[PDB]
Amino acid sequence: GETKAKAAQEALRAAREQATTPEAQKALEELEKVLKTASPEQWRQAAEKIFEAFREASNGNTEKAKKLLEEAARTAGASPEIIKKLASALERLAEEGAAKEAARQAEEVRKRGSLEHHHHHH
């Protein structure tokens, strides 16, 4: 039983948590509605470029990050309508001045995936 499946979902999920602007948080959710229907093999192939885009755009690579976003979407079989929705968040992420929480949010995914599956019930 391998953590690679958890780490792929957790890459995009953490990107929606760490996104410092409300316009990015809703835009990342758009891709995930398609990936919820997408195949687990393609999910790893996609989440790699999806999460690389946020790494590039925060370093000032809006033009590269948008291309990674398109590449992952075309790999997962996703819509031009979600591609533009998510990729627009990368165009602001460069001028927004990066998302410093991404660095510590990625440490969980690098070490294990996550510390916990769920805990809240009451």
Cα–Cα distance, 62 to 48 (Å, whole number): 17
Cα–Cα distance, 89 to 91 (Å, whole number): 5
Considering the domain boundaries, does residue 121 fall inside one? no
DSSP 3-state helix, strand, coil percentages of the chain (rounded to 5)? Answer: 75, 0, 25
Q: At 120, list the tokens.
A: 């809240």
Considering the domain boundaries, does residue 27 fall inside one? yes
First to last CA, the chain: 30
H or E stretch covering 87: helix 80-95
Cα–Cα distance, 28 to 92 (Å, whole number): 13
Are 57 and 93 contacting, i.e. CB atoms less than 8 angstroms apart? Answer: yes
Domain span at residue 46 reads: 4-108
Report the domain count for the chain. 1
